[PDB]
Paper text:
Cholesterol absorption within enterocytes is mediated by Niemann-Pick C1 Like 1 (NPC1L1), a protein primarily expressed in the intestine and the target of the cholesterol absorption inhibitor Ezetimibe. NPC1L1 is a polytopic membrane protein that contains two conserved domains: the sterol sensing domain and the NPC1 domain. The NPC1 domain resides in the amino-terminal extracellular loop and is highly conserved in all NPC1 homologues. NPC1L1 has high sequence homology (∼40%) to lysosomal NPC1, which mediates transport of LDL-derived cholesterol out of lysosomes for subsequent delivery to the endoplasmic reticulum and plasma membrane.
A recombinant form of human NPC1L1(NTD) spanning residues 22–284 was produced in High-5 cells using a baculovirus vector. According to size exclusion chromatography, NPC1L1(NTD) exists as a monomer in solution (data not shown). In the current study, we have determined the crystal structure of NPC1L1(NTD) to 2.8 Å resolution in a cholesterol free, closed form. The structure of NPC1L1(NTD), while sharing the same overall topology as NPC1(NTD), reveals a cholesterol binding pocket that is closed from solvent, suggesting a gating mechanism that relies on the movement of multiple elements around the cholesterol entrance. Comparison to the cholesterol free and bound structures of NPC1(NTD) reveals that NPC1L1(NTD) is in a closed conformation and the sterol binding pocket is occluded from solvent. Comparison of apo-NPC1L1(NTD) to the sterol bound forms of NPC1(NTD) suggests a gating model where multiple movements around the entrance to the sterol binding pocket are required to expand the entrance and allow entry of cholesterol. The cholesterol binding pocket is slightly larger than that of NPC1(NTD), suggesting broader sterol specificity. Residues near the C4 position are smaller in NPC1L1 (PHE35 and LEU216) compared to NPC1 (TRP27 and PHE203), increasing the size of the sterol binding pocket and accommodating C4 substituted sterols such as lanosterol. While the residues near the C4 position are smaller in NPC1L1 compared to NPC1, residues around the isooctyl sidechain are roughly equivalent. The addition of an ethyl group at C24 on β-sitosterol would result in an unfavorable steric clash and we were unable to observe significant competitive binding of β-sitosterol to NPC1L1(NTD).
Residue numbers in the entry: 22 to 265
Write the structure that this text describes.
């Protein structure tokens, strides 16, 4: 049985929280619940749900007329599981923003079903909708490379250690990669992800005829300022901010 049959704009892959991930062994306190399979049109985001979305996924706030594919409950689970990594990237807010937006789209994008295809589900309760336990994210290769490049040189708070090296499994910083960096982030055995995420980093010639449209969102360059702040990550954290 297919789980994500409608791959359309304005259409979600999953919506709401279903509960604990059964494949995750009771070893470290799980900070996230898992999502309910819901290949349905995106929701209009209002009230409290708006503020959360605005604060947790700023780049997905599109004015009073906002649509998204994550409930209020899902946004709390999002920030919970991002808290660990967000801490490592507090030197360079642009890279931090990029990392967060990468997962925000995966969970909240009103178009998520175009680049997300759930592969495995689990029935958590009786009468309840099935729970999404594994999915694959389709990204454009350049979007992934640009996201990784903005973070590849960031230092850990008050240290010289590179943050991506603390996030690339058996590969160090030297061997680390846009592909592998993401592979770690969607890996259960690496104790980071709440569920199995499979990252496919495609070039246009691969996505042709797939019936899928890979994510190609704008990624902030750390040598450029965001909004009206007029502030940029240092040359030690950002190769593009050099010469200093
Ligand atoms: C996870 O599931 C339980 C039971 O439905 C619920 O108490 C909890 O709020 C959910 N989400 C979080 C944030 O753990
Ligand atoms: C989505 O998942 C189904 C089930 O594994 C698979 O057959 C289908 O090809 C996937 N869609 C892709 C790879 O675009």
């Amino acid at each position: 049985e297919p789980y994500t049959t409608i791959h359309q704009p304005g259409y979600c892959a999953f919506y709401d929280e279903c509960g604990k991930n059964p494949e995750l062994s009771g070893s470290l306190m799980t900070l996230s619940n898992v999502s309910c399979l819901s290949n349905t049109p995106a929701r209009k985001i209002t009230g409290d749900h708006l503020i959360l979305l605005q604060k947790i996924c700023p780049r997905l706030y599109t004015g009073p007329n906002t649509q998204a594919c994550c409930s209020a409950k899902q946004l709390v689970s999002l920030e919970a599981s991002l808290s660990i990594t967000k801490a490592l990237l507090t030197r360079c807010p642009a890279c931090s923003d990029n990392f967060v937006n990468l997962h925000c789209h995966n969970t909240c994008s009103p178009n998520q079903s175009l680049f997300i295809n759930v592969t495995r589900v689990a029935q958590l309760g009786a009468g309840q909708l099935p729970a999404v336990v594994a999915y694959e994210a389709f990204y454009q290769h350049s979007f992934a490379e640009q996201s990784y490049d903005s973070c590849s040189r960031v230092r850990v708070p008050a240290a010289a250690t590179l943050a991506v090296g603390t996030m690339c499994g058996v590969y160090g910083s030297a061997l680390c990669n846009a592909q592998r960096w993401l592979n770690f982030q969607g890996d259960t055995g690496n104790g980071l992800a709440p569920l199995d995420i499979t990252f496919h980093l495609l070039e246009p010639g691969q996505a042709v005829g797939s019936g899928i449209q890979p994510l190609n969102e704008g990624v902030a360059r750390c040598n450029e300022s965001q909004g009206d702040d007029v502030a940029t990550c240092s040359c030690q954290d950002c190769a593009a901010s050099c010469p200093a």
